[PDB]
RNA sequence: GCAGGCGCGCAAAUUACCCAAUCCUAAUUCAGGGAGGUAGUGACAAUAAAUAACGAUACAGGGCCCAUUCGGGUCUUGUAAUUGGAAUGAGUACAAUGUAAAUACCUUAACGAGGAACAAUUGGAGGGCAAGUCUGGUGCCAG
């Protein structure tokens, strides 16, 4: 499906910082 | 005072063994103490507490009556022959103990598989 | 190497662990033979589990039709006898009303023979004739009046034949398979096609005929003289409603 | 196409700055608003945080979670345009922060 | 000298409204609101009570003339 | 369990309120459980009515069904026909449960006291201690209900509070 | 960390990257580790690993697992949900069970740290 | 006891749902359909395009009442002899009659839809 | 393959026990079997129950509830933690059964309730209050 994926791919979104 | 009864007493000379379903009625006791009830069962049968063996108990809901399965037979020597080791450990007539649970003896025999040689070692 | 899609006439529950006993190679097919494990554990309950079934087989104790055969998964199936010296017993194990395997309790002089439908007959080697029946008893030297789909009375002590049985109109037959499984009687008519779908047709008290393929059925005997004492008082399974009607009558 | 932002029900957004700090009237719809950077599009929209008393948890670039709003009526001070409420800040639910069960880590 | 955690830090149910012992037991509130709904329709209709309890010393609550509570047929 | 079609009617809400109130229930799920088995029992009872009289399917399974319902007791033996199973309703089903039945039998003085002393394992049906309200006592075992042998309302030892207070009065 | 001083506890919370956190399941939580948890929460959360020692509760293993599930629930509501904690048994001859110790060392071998802005 | 009216019978025929077996399959109980003779007046006055509805109203299962009111306004006769008694279940399909009925408190009413009757305000429908 | 993990800086069964059962394999009753079985975790579904029950007394009646329009009906209403003994299981635990051993269930000594504090949550709907704040303007208002 797209339903169980298009909400769980926002775990890959963050604030861009450096390490 | 309890009362132990037996039922469906079927003989079995294929193991020389008389098997049945035992039901105890204890009106106020908690449970019937497997050793104590098996020695009373040997008393109401011919003999040999060590050669009677009762094993399948459960106390029914609300208390009062417990039901299990019971084996009596003669001849304690073939009681050593025809009964499993855990029950012969449960009664005090046999004992078997090992140490290495699964992984320790598993790695032990894997190490022996690795070794393949007997007791020689040099420097 | 596994199981649990067992033939459901083995009285096998579903919560007895996963696997069922796989029948090893032997006389019979797997679909119509029960092993000694499913016999001695959960058919007459003389044992409890496979460890003590192995005990009462390797006690030199069981004798399937004349010999010990220490093997748990031994497919002793249809028309065999299983004698046990202790418990006095001989079990000819046959079919029944519903389809499963009915035990008997057979005395010695009926327990010193079985019988067998011939599966094929040829000439083996060195001129010698050649008979094989349903359990793999490839037996030399018959009487020469051999037909196929035919019953021979195996002596079962020494493996020869003691009596011969032909097949025609007016002599008994017993079905092993189909929807009509475990049923006797032979009196309508003897119809035969070519290419199968033929049966020695079956009587009833109300002239009810059951026609199947001829590989399943085979002769027991004749009128008044069957060669096996029959299960549950000659079970023809009239009806449950007729059973309750006879209950209301008598 | 199945949602106000792509197809997702929620989207992580980076808070730019608090809209309406200098509104004098407390609990006003200008006051309870905040600029937020959609990441999966990458563009700036404006969004609500309910209870301007618990506005002060979320401050600046704290990866908040952005859900729908759903006007179930016609409130007086309610401006149109916004349909995004804030449901979490930096992982933890700011509703739970408002009823002070959990804690905001940084 | 061993410290602990007290009740609010243990349970973490901080900052709730005032809840109710009535709502704690999901049967009791249906017992204790059926009791009200009994006593509510003592006012709506005049439900039967058990008949003549004592000796008949009047209906104890009044009788009015210009009022008939009987449904008419169109 | 089974959920209704339109559950949020005020008529159904007053229904559940009245049934739960005067029979001492704990939520609407008890009503829905026995209403579901009532619905399946008369949906299996009506198609036997729609098929022909003296069809042996109808005859045997109708006599089976009413033999079950007489023994549970929701169908009195004066009405031994299948359309009375259609005429049956759900208050007859929750009349036969053990909580309401012991309150009708006396010894409980209120329906919720009946439920709570059932749950305190005080009541045995003949031989067996039963600690559930929704039991559906059959018509034979109606007159077997009294207090358990191992209960202070029966003939056992006095309970915890009784012997504790007797010890403190011995002090 | 010397456990009697916020004077140390604050700056250790500032510098640390992993903190393994030593509850005793015989006693439940304590306000010392609650204080340290809030200090780490506000100064920026390092990666936290719970470990619960002193599992000599009783023969009542039902109490043992009930206290363990209460501890893991109070831990999950207070550091991130489903965080990892390890149940250590009693000390055996100077040190802990090497099974749980080797598993713990495995997790800190694959920890994969993260940046914080301070 | 199910009161019937004209548009209910017409809609039931044009949806081909039987009356008594339709009510039994909708409600899972014995239903006694009851036609007021004032509504049979309207079902006669509809004319010869509804003779099927007429000879299906004439049915010995459908036992019929007797009215006492001048004229043949079946909707007012239905709402009157319902709110006198509150023992009947109204079968209808009129929107305004449905609104009158679901305004008065707590009688059940049913209406044909799709290919079976549906029942509105009755608790023990399952 | 099993266990555990990793590949994002944002995440979820244990690197547990055992051949005791069901079977399988083998020189073969035995040995082996991460096949398989047990335990732990598991708001993934399903089934059943508790989170209290019974009284007694004192008072308040300007009292309650149902009414879209001044209508109707009722101590058989509410509060007083005023107050009393009974009953119990969550939990605890001698034990015993259970099982390969153990845990779980059932059974059970002695304990274990009053705010039964042994302290049910999630929502939703509404008010009211200041020597208080802010904004508008035909005083004293409105927002
Ligand atoms: Zn009329």
Cα–Cα distances (Å) from H19 to C157, C207, H14, H31, H52, in that order, read: 78, 48, 12, 10, 13
Length of chain B: 123
- The set of chains that have 3 or more CB pairs under 8 A with H is E, F
Q: Which domain holds residue D10?
A: 1-106
CA distance E49 to E53: 9
Q: Which residues contact H120 (CB under 8 A, 6 or more apart)?
A: H102, H108, H109, H110, H111
Q: Report whether D58 contacts D35 (CB < 8 A).
A: no
Residues C21 and C45 in one domain: yes
CA neighbor of F138 nearest in space, from F41, F70, F66: F70
Token pair for residue D88?
Answer: 């979490």
CA distance F24 to F131: 15
Residues C80 and C97 in one domain: yes
Closest nucleotide relative to residue C52's CA, C1' based? I29
Q: Report the SS3 class of residue H2.
A: strand
Q: Report whether D54 contacts D97 (CB < 8 A).
A: yes
Q: Report whether B80 contacts B98 (CB < 8 A).
A: no
Q: Report whether E4 contacts G30 (CB < 8 A).
A: yes
Ligand 1 center from residue H125 Cα (angstroms): 28
| Residue C91 neighbours by CB distance under 10 Å | 22
For chains F and G, having 3+ Cβ pairs within 8 Å is answered no
Tell me how far apart the 2 most distant CA atoms of chain H are, in Å.
40
The residues facing H118 across adjacent strands are H111
> Tokens 């704290």 identify what position?
D62
What is the DSSP secondary structure assignment for residue F52, as one 8-state letter? P
To the nearest 10 degrees (0 to 180), the angle between helices F98-105 and F111-119 is 120
**Technique used by the depositors:** cryo-EM
Q: Report the SS3 class of residue B7.
A: strand
User: How long is the CA G86 to C1' I4 vector, in angstroms?
Assistant: 14
Instruction: Name the helix (H) or strand (E) containing H76.
Output: helix H74-83
Beta strands D64-68 and D33-38 are unpaired
Ligand 1 center from residue H112 Cα (angstroms): 23
CA distance H96 to B113: 92
Please give the full DSSP string across chain C, using - where no structure is assigned.
---S---GGG---SSS-S--PPP-SSSS-STT---HHHHHTTTS-S-SSHHHHHHHHTTT--EETTB----TT----TT-EEEETGGGEEEEEE--SSSS-EE----HHHHS-EEEEEEEEEE-STT-EEEEETTS-EE----S---SS-EEEE-SSSSSEEEEE---TTS--EE-SSTT-S-B---S-B---SSS---B----TT-------TTTEE----SS--SSPPTTTT-----HHHHHHHHHH-
CA distance C160 to C142: 9
Q: Report the SS3 class of residue F126.
A: coil
Length of chain G: 118
Q: With contacts defined as CB-CB under 8 Å, which chain G residues touch D91? A: 80
Burial string for C26-44 (b: 16+ CB within 10 Å, else e) reads bbbebebbbbbbbbbbbbe
Instruction: Name the helix (H) or strand (E) containing D92.
Output: strand D92-93
Within-domain flag for C247 = no
Token pair for residue C90?
Answer: 């001989």
Which positions in strand I are less than 7 Å from the protein's CB atoms?
A: 4-12, 14-25, 29-30, 33-37, 40-42, 46-55, 64-66, 71-78, 85-89, 91-109, 111-113, 116, 119-124, 134-135, 143
* B3-113 is a CATH 3.30.70.3370 domain: yes
Q: Report the SS3 class of residue G2.
A: coil
CA distance C231 to C101: 10
Here the contacts of G1-9 (C-beta below 8 Å, separation 24 or greater) are G1/G36, G3/G32, G6/G35, G6/G39, G9/G35, G9/G36, G9/G39
Token pair for residue C52?
Answer: 């003590």
CA distance H57 to H36: 11
Please give the full DSSP string across B31-96, using - where no structure is assigned.
---HHHHHHHHHHHSSS-GGGEEE---EEPTTSSEEEEEEEEES-HHHHHHHS-HHHHHHTTT---
Q: Report whether C45 contacts B69 (CB < 8 A).
A: no
Query: Hey, which bits of G1-118 come out as E strands?
Result: 18-24, 47-53, 85-87
Token pair for residue B54?
Answer: 């009762």
The residues facing H34 across adjacent strands are H3, H63
Token pair for residue B111?
Answer: 């190490």
Cα–Cα distances (Å) from D84 to C59, C128, D9, F102, F131, in that order, read: 82, 97, 11, 58, 53
Nearest-Cα distance to chain F for H30, in Å, is 7
State this model's resolution in angstroms: 3.8
Q: Report the SS3 class of residue F49.
A: helix
Name the domain count of chain D.
Answer: 1
Name the domain count of chain C.
Answer: 3
Instruction: Judge whether residue B40 contacts strand I, using its CB and a 7 Å cut-off.
Output: no
Q: Where are the domains of chain B?
A: 3-113
Torsion, Cα D85 D89 D95 D99, to 10 degrees, reads -150
**CA nearest to G40 within chain D:** D105
CA distance H11 to H46: 14
Q: Which domain holds residue C175?
A: 167-237
Q: What are phi and psi of D65, to 5 degrees?
A: -100, 135
Instruction: Name the helix (H) or strand (E) containing D66.
Output: strand D64-68
Token pair for residue C10?
Answer: 């083995």
CA distance B19 to C47: 10
Beta strands G47-53 and G18-24 are parallel
Q: Report whether C73 contacts C26 (CB < 8 A).
A: no
Q: Which domain CATH number covers C181?
A: 2.30.30.30
Q: Report whether H48 contacts H70 (CB < 8 A).
A: no
Tell me how far apart the 2 most distant CA atoms of chain E are, in Å.
87
User: How long is the CA C233 to C1' I140 vector, in angstroms?
Assistant: 113
Cα–Cα distances (Å) from H30 to D72, H27, H59, H118, in that order, read: 45, 8, 16, 16
Q: Report whether B98 contacts B90 (CB < 8 A).
A: no
CA distance H30 to F88: 11
The residues facing C90 across adjacent strands are C83
Whether D7 and A2 lie within 8 Å, measured CB to CB: yes
Within-domain flag for C61 = yes
CA distance F88 to F54: 23
């Amino acid at each position: 499906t797209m339903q169980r994926s298009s909400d769980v791919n926002e775990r890959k979104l963050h604030v861009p910082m450096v390490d | 005072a309890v009362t132990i009864r037996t039922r469906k007493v079927i003989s079995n000379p294929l193991l020389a063994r008389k098997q049945f379903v035992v039901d105890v009625l204890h009106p106020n006791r908690a449970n019937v103490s497997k050793d104590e009830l098996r020695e009373k069962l040997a008393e109401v049968y011919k003999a040999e507490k060590d050669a009677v063996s009762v094993f399948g108990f459960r106390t029914q809901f609300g208390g009062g009556k417990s039901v299990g399965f019971g084996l009596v037979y003669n001849s304690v020597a073939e009681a050593k022959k025809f009964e499993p080791t855990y029950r012969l450990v449960r009664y005090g007539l046999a004992e078997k103990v090992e140490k290495a649970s699964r992984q320790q003896r598993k790695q032990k025999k894997n190490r022996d598989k690795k070794i393949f040689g007997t007791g020689k070692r040099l420097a | 190497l596994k199981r649990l899609a067992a033939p459901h006439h083995w009285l096998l529950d579903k919560l007895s662990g996963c696997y069922a006993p796989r029948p090893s190679a032997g006389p019979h097919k797997l679909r119509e033979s029960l092993p000694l494990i499913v016999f001695l554990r959960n058919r007459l309950k003389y044992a409890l589990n496979g460890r003590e079934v192995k005990a009462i087989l390797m006690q030199r104790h069981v004798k399937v039709d004349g010999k010990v055969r220490t093997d748990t998964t031994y497919p002793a199936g249809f028309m065999d006898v299983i004698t046990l010296d202790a418990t006095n017993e001989n079990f000819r194990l046959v079919y029944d009303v519903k389809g499963r395997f009915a035990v008997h309790r057979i005395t010695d002089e009926e327990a010193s023979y079985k019988l067998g439908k011939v599966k094929k007959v040829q000439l083996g080697k060195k001129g010698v004739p050649y008979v094989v029946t349903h359990d793999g008893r490839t037996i030399r030297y018959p009487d020469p009046n051999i037909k196929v789909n035919d019953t021979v009375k195996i002596d079962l002590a020494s493996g020869k034949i003691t009596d011969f049985i032909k097949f025609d109109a007016g002599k008994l037959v017993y079905v092993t398979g189909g929807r009509n499984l475990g049923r006797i009687g032979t009196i309508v008519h003897k119809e035969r096609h070519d290419g199968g779908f033929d049966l020695v047709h079956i009587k009833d008290s109300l002239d009810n005929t059951f026609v199947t393929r001829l590989n399943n059925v085979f002769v027991i005997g004749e009128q008044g003289k069957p060669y096996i004492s029959l299960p549950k008082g000659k079970g023809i399974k009239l009806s449950i409603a007729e059973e309750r009607d006879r209950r209301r009558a008598q | 196409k199945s949602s106000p932002f792509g197809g997702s029900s929620h989207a992580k957004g980076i808070v730019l700055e608090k809209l309406g700090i200098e509104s004098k009237q407390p609990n006003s719809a200008i006051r309870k608003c905040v600029r937020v950077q959609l990441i999966k599009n990458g563009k700036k929209v404006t969004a609500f945080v309910p209870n301007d008393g618990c506005l002060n948890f979320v401050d600046e670039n704290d990866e908040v979670l952005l859900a729908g709003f759903g006007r179930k009526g016609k409130a007086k001070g309610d401006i149109p345009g916004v349909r995004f409420k804030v449901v979490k800040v930096s992982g933890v639910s700011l509703l739970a922060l408002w009823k002070e069960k959990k804690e905001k880590p940084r | 000298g061993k410290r602990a955690i007290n009740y609010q830090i243990l349970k973490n149910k901080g900052l709730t409204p005032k809840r109710n012992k009535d709502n704690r037991n999901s049967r009791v509130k249906k017992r204790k609101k059926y009791q009200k709904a009994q006593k509510k329709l003592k006012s709506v209709r005049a439900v039967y009570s058990g008949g003549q309890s004592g000796v008949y010393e009047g209906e104890k609550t009044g009788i009015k003339k210009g009022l008939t509570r009987s449904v008419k047929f169109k | 369990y089974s959920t209704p079609k339109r559950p949020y009617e005020s008529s159904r809400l007053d229904a559940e309120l009245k049934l739960a109130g005067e029979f001492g229930l704990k939520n609407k799920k008890e009503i829905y459980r026995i209403s579901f088995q009532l619905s399946k029992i008369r949906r299996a009872a009506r198609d036997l009515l729609t098929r022909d009289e003296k069809d042996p399917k109808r005859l045997f399974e109708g006599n089976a069904l009413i033999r079950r319902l007489v023994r549970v007791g929701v169908l009195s033996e004066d009405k031994k026909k299948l359309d009375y199973v259609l005429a049956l309703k759900v208050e007859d089903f929750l009349e036969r449960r053990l909580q309401t039945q012991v309150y009708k039998l006396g010894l409980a003085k209120s329906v919720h006291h009946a439920r709570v002393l059932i749950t305190q394992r005080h009541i045995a049906v003949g031989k067996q201690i039963v600690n559930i309200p929704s039991f559906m006592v059959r018509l034979d075992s109606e007159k077997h209900i009294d207090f358990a042998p191992t209960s202070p309302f029966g003939g056992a030892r006095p309970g915890r509070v009784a012997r504790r207070n007797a010890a403190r009065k011995a002090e | 960390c010397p456990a009697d001083d916020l004077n140390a506890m604050i700056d250790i919370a500032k510098i640390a990257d992993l903190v393994l956190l030593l509850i005793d399941g015989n006693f439940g939580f304590e306000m010392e580790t609650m204080e340290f948890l809030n200090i780490a929460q506000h100064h920026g959360m390092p990666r936290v690993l719970g470990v619960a020692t002193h599992l000599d509760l009783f023969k009542s293993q039902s109490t043992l697992r009930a206290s363990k599930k209460r501890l893991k629930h109070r831990f999950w509501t207070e550091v991130y949900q489903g965080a990892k904690l390890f149940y250590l048994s009693g000390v055996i001859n100077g040190r802990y069970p090497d099974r749980e110790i080797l598993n713990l060392s495995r997790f800190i071998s694959v920890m994969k740290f993260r940046p914080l802005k301070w | 006891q199910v009161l019937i009216d004209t548009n209910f019978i017409n809609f039931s025929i044009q949806k081909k749902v039987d009356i008594v077996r339709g009510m039994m399959d909708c409600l899972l109980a014995k239903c006694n359909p009851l036609i007021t003779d004032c509504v049979m007046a309207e079902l006669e006055k509809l004319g010869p395009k509804y003779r099927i509805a007429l000879k299906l109203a004439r049915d010995p299962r459908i036992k019929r009442l007797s009215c006492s009111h001048k004229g043949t306004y079946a909707d007012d006769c239905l709402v009157h002899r319902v709110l006198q008694h509150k023992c009947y279940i109204v079968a209808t399909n009129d929107a305004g009659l449905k609104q009158r009925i679901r305004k008065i408190p707590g009688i059940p009413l049913m209406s044909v839809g799709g290919h079976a009757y549906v029942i509105e305000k009755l608790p023990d429908v399952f």
